[PDB]
Structure formats: structure tokens, C-alpha cells
Amino acid sequence: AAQTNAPWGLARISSTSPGTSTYYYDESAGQGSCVYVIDTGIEASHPEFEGRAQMVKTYYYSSRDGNGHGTHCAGTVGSRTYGVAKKTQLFGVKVLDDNGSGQYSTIIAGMDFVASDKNNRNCPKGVVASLSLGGGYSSSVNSAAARLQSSGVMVAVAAGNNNADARNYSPASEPSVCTVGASDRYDRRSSFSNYGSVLDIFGPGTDILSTWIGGSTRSISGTSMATPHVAGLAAYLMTLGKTTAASACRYIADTANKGDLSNIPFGTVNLLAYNNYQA
Ligand SMILES: [Pr+3]
Ligand SMILES: [Pr+3]
Secondary structure: OOOOOOHHHHHOOOOOOOOOOEEEEOOOOOOOOOEEEEEOOOOOOOOOHOOOOOEEEOOOOOOOOOOHHHHHHHHHHHOOOOOOOOOOOOEEEEOOOOOOOOOHHHHHHHHHHHHHHHHOOOOOOOOEEEEOOOOOOOHHHHHHHHHHHHHOOEEEEEOOOOOOHHHHEEOOOOOEEEEEEEEEOEEEOOOOOOOOOOOOOOEEOEEEEEEEOOOOEEOOOOOHHHHHHHHHHHHHHHHOOOOOOOOHHHHHHHOOOOOOEEEOOEEEOOOEOOOOOOO
């Protein structure tokens, strides 16, 4: 399948080179997989989700995304126009408030929730969780991410926007998950992207167009935007049967574009998420 004039991030993930505009992908499009977006919520009513999104848990007064951040990330996972895996099922878990903030206790509860809740869903091709969030180092937050991964969920987490070593941020610094840095459309490390040995992979993160609340769209930047590219890619590859929740991050690194990125510090992987679609 081919989407013409795609957001640059989608085009990038289906090309060995920067600068292309068409997103090439297998028509299976992540069908049969499930992605939990653990964030500010998802505006499930957005036409771009086509009925494939639903809120399943909130830790606040409402399940509504009153911010937009979660809706943007969910859109990059699986919206029609802005999504990597355009036919996946999206599940919203609101651990962040409408200012985009959340307590670590709540974020941990949300991860534990997904580990259990997946056992009540039909997700024959597997389960992914996208965590576009984080703050300073916490062994408890890292452990929650490790548990979620161990439970059989492909966990993708943001590296953080501190232009620093991700070792000092959580859940980024949890080794057993998939820690995602951000790149821009000229294949530079995004100016804000964290780096370091714990990064597993980079995804498009600068000037990423996706869904927003109020049935709208906008372009924003962050390792928060790179993370759902990788979560969506994992879902897509799992639907194709090429990999599993336990092995998808490694598979994505195995098959990534290598050495294409600039301003990568020595000791940080130079690996950019790539779907290797061959029609
Ligand atoms: Pr290349
Ligand atoms: Pr890792």
C-alpha cells in the first residue's frame, strides 16, 4: 500500500533515505494488534481513529483528553492519515492530567493496569504499549516498565527531551524496554533528544503532524512523537508475524537504517526505525 504526501515521519520509516514523501506499507497495517497509549487520554471520537480507539482506564475525574498530547501520540501510532499502523486497535490509559503531568505512583499503576487488562482483550497479533512520558530517575518506575514488558507487552518509552544522557531519566533508563530517541527530517538527532547507551532506536520526532483534540490536527516535537512511531512499527511487524512483543525492539534495531543520523554521540546507537517494506 502507499500513502502519497504522507507526514515526513511516515515516509521516513519506509525509506532508506531522507527526503521522500510517500509512506509505503503492507496493507495488513497492524490489524489484529493492540496498542495501549499511556498518556493524557485519547479523543476516541476523532474521525481519524475510525472507531478503532477507546478509553479503557482513567486515573482522573474524566477519561477525556483535555490536553491533546495523548491524542497526538495515539494518532502517530494508528490514525488513518497520521498513523504507522493504520488498522491497529488503540486503547487509552489516562495517567497524565490535562496539563500533561502525572505522579509516578499513577504512571506505575497505569502500567500495571495494562499488564492485566490485556488478558481481557482480543489481540491475536500481540500487544504494544507506548509511553510518551517520563521524568527523573526512579527505580520503581523502571521496574513497572520492566514488569509490563515481562508480562508480554512490547514497551516503547520516550528517551526524554533533556539533550542529556537518558540514564538519568525514567522509564527511559529501564534497560529491558525499547527506549526511543528523536530525529528530524534531515536525519539529525533532534536538538532536544536524549542520548546514551540505553537508547535502543531513533524515530521521527521533530515537526510531527498528527491528531489533536477538538477533532483537529497539529505538528509538535518531542521524543514523545518518536516513541509512537516505534510502537506503531512494532504493532505493524507483529501483525506481519515477523516478530513478537519480547523481540520486536531488537528486531527493529536489527533492521533499522544504520549510520544515517548526524550529531549522534559516540556510544549512542545510530539506528533509525525502518519497516523494510518490499512490495
Ligand atoms: Pr541510508
Ligand atoms: Pr532496551
